[PDB]
Amino acid sequence: ASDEEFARPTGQGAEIRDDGETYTTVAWNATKLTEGSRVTDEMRDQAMV
Amino acid sequence: FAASDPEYVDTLFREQLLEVVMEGRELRKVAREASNVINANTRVGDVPI
Ligand SMILES: [Mg+2]
Numbered sequence A: 001a002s003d004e005e006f007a008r009p010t011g012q013g014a015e016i017r018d019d020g021e022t023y024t025t026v027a028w029n030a031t032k033l034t035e036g037s038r039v040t041d042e043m044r045d046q047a048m049v
Numbered sequence B: 001f002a003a004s005d006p007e008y009v010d011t012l013f014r015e016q017l018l019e020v021v022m023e024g025r026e027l028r029k030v031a032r033e034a035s036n037v038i039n040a041n042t043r044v045g046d047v048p049i
């Protein structure tokens, strides 16, 4: 969203004027982070941990 | 010839295949009866004497 502004000093019976929210955007591009580990079956079985 | 089985051996019939497959060399398996089988928790270990 656009930064906040201030409402306007207005006469009685006078038109309420427009200062609408103007918009922009920021892009995301999510990078894949990966880590693996390999263990032998013998190691997986024998570990105390 | 006239009609002979060595002419039509793959055309009028198919050679018999005997349903029993003949076993090759079978080695004598005795270690499990002929020793004490230890089901170990590790690949490398020691036994107290
Ligand atoms: Mg007007």
Ligand SMILES: [Mg+2]
Residues within 6 Å of the ligand: A005, A019
């Ligand atoms: Mg403005």
Ligand SMILES: [Mg+2]
Residues within 6 Å of the ligand: B044, B045, B046
């Ligand atoms: Mg040892």
